[PDB]
């Protein structure tokens, strides 16, 4: 019943993930996003009924409220899967937000960064590893000031042993991946959060090529508080065991006195 149950609007974007369209549920009038994924181009499948991993992972996290975009429904077709997802309104992704406004005031980066951490914790707590945390995978609900994680298509079940496959973004990938093709979930996630935070406070990523990643030296082109630079360098420690846990990130001095999402919208987004 898919074509009667939702009403298709403009293409929101396309890339490695497939094609994603703006939509309306005709039932509720609810704004949704409609993601089409070609079966040919799915590396990794899961089960409940053989499905894309994204579907497994999203069901594991979609129980309860969160900073992750919910799987509302899904459909199989002969050559594609179709996923129905929350669409916040109005909305802008963090990539476009940063491309437009440049480097972000710390107070705002702090608010955004905290929310990302809450969301990643929530995922890990549900047994899910994202594997592609970056600006293009974070949405900002502009009215409520709430960040939501998207695109679980490179994700895995969380586990405590090493991962030897990676299908996320190279410049967000830790040096242990680049040199040895091995990493552990949590410490690789922390590396990529280090990259994210630098991107927030400088308006751009710290490392462009592999040689820079491997070397792991951070130069700041923008004025950034010494507390913030400390946290960034800590998350981008070359040795994974030298990186902080999520607990240590959230207890870090730069993370004190976070604004609530609502107060963050009033000040920085309205
Ligand atoms: Cl509104 C919304 C809801 C749920 C979404 C997505 C968007 N997207 C958005 C991707 C396109 C962006 C939009 C802005 C311009 N830059 C590119 C998405 C991408 C990949 N997997 C799941 C997704 O789920």
């Amino acid at each position: 019943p898919l074509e009667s149950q939702y009403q298709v609007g403009p293409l929101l974007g396309s890339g490695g993930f497939g094609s994603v369209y703006s939509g309306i549920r005709v039932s509720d009038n609810l704004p949704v996003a409609i993601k089409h994924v070609e079966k040919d181009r799915i590396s990794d499948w899961g089960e409940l009924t053989r499905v894309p991993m994204e579907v497994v992972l999203l069901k594991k996290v979609s129980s309860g409220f969160s900073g992750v975009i919910r799987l509302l429904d899904w459909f199989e077709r002969p050559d594609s899967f179709v996923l129905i997802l929350e669409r916040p309104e109005p909305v802008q992704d963090l990539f476009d937000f940063i491309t437009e406004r440049g480097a972000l005031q710390e107070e705002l980066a702090r608010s955004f960064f905290w929310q990302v951490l809450e969301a990643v914790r929530h995922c890990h707590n549900c047994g899910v590893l994202h594997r592609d945390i970056k600006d293009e995978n974070i949405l900002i609900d502009l009215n409520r000031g709430e960040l939501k994680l998207i695109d679980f298509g490179s994700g895995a079940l969380l586990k405590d042993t090493v991962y030897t496959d990676f299908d996320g973004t190279r410049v967000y990938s830790p040096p242990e991946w680049i040199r040895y093709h091995r990493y552990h979930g949590r410490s690789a996630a922390v590396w990529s959060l280090g990259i994210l935070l630098y991107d927030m406070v400088c308006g751009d990523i710290p490392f462009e090529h592999d040689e820079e990643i491997i070397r792991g030296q951070v130069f700041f082109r923008q004025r950034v508080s010494s507390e913030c630079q400390h946290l960034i360098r800590w998350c981008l420690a070359l040795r994974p065991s030298d990186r902080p846990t999520f607990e240590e990130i959230q207890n870090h001095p730069w993370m004190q006195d976070v604004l609530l999402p609502q107060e963050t919208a009033e000040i920085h987004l309205h």
Side-chain angles (χ1 to χ4, degrees), residues 1-27 29-46 49-270:
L2 158 67
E3 290 97 331
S4 81
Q5 208 185 308
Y6 299 98
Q7 198 194 293
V8 181
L11 180 72
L12 288 179
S14 77
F17 56 87
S19 305
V20 177
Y21 293 81
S22 191
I24 315 286
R25 200 161 64 192
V26 304
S27 342
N29 271 334
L30 187 69
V32 294
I34 306 176
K35 174 172 188 168
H36 292 78
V37 188
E38 280 189 34
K39 293 192 190 179
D40 318 59
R41 289 195 297 100
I42 298 166
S43 56
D44 226 309
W45 299 70
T49 20
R50 230 168 73 95
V51 294
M53 197 55 69
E54 187 162 21
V55 175
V56 176
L57 303 179
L58 280 175
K59 291 167 83 61
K60 288 167 76 53
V61 307
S62 288
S63 179
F65 290 130
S66 269
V68 2
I69 266 179
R70 302 267 212 73
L71 185 65
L72 290 175
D73 206 354
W74 68 277
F75 301 87
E76 190 174 349
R77 273 171 166 182
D79 303 302
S80 61
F81 282 86
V82 178
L83 279 66
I84 311 304
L85 303 165
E86 274 193 78
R87 182 163 59 79
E89 181 50 29
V91 76
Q92 196 184 24
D93 70 23
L94 190 54
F95 182 83
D96 293 326
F97 184 95
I98 289 156
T99 294
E100 285 185 6
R101 287 135 152 277
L104 274 40
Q105 277 173 224
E106 284 179 37
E107 192 178 63
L108 181 58
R110 169 180 310 112
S111 168
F112 280 10
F113 192 64
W114 179 269
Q115 287 191 257
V116 171
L117 280 148
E118 290 288 300
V120 168
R121 288 175 58 202
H122 177 265
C123 290
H124 291 8
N125 202 245
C126 296
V128 177
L129 191 74
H130 193 272
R131 296 208 287 184
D132 205 14
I133 294 166
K134 53 164 172 181
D135 53 7
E136 303 183 357
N137 286 327
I138 292 161
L139 297 183
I140 305 160
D141 169 356
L142 275 357
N143 289 338
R144 306 187 150 293
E146 295 181 358
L147 268 57
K148 279 155 189 312
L149 250 53
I150 55 150
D151 199 355
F152 284 77
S154 317
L157 297 182
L158 189 58
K159 76 189 189 187
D160 291 305
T161 49
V162 76
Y163 292 85
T164 58
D165 76 300
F166 174 76
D167 220 85
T169 317
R170 184 157 203 87
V171 297
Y172 286 79
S173 78
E176 63 272 20
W177 170 252
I178 302 301
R179 303 170 46 72
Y180 312 129
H181 285 72
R182 32 204 294 122
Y183 62 98
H184 288 95
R186 297 184 193 76
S187 50
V190 165
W191 169 272
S192 76
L193 295 159
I195 303 302
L196 183 60
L197 178 54
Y198 182 98
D199 186 56
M200 285 181 207
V201 299
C202 301
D204 214 355
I205 56 169
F207 309 131
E208 154 69 311
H209 323 276
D210 292 358
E211 306 84 50
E212 298 170 291
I213 296 175
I214 283 171
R215 182 165 187 253
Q217 219 141 308
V218 182
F219 296 105
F220 289 90
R221 73 206 80 203
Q222 190 77 31
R223 162 65 196 203
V224 174
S225 78
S226 28
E227 302 270 45
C228 186
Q229 293 188 22
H230 184 266
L231 182 49
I232 288 171
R233 290 190 169 99
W234 197 12
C235 299
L236 304 182
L238 284 176
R239 293 164 67 244
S241 67
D242 291 336
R243 294 177 198 146
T245 56
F246 301 108
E247 184 170 5
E248 296 167 292
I249 292 174
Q250 292 186 289
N251 289 323
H252 185 283
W254 188 75
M255 293 286 259
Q256 290 324 291
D257 286 290
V258 81
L259 297 180
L260 291 175
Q262 202 59 257
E263 345 179 63
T264 308
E266 288 174 337
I267 300 160
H268 296 283
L269 309 178
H270 297 354

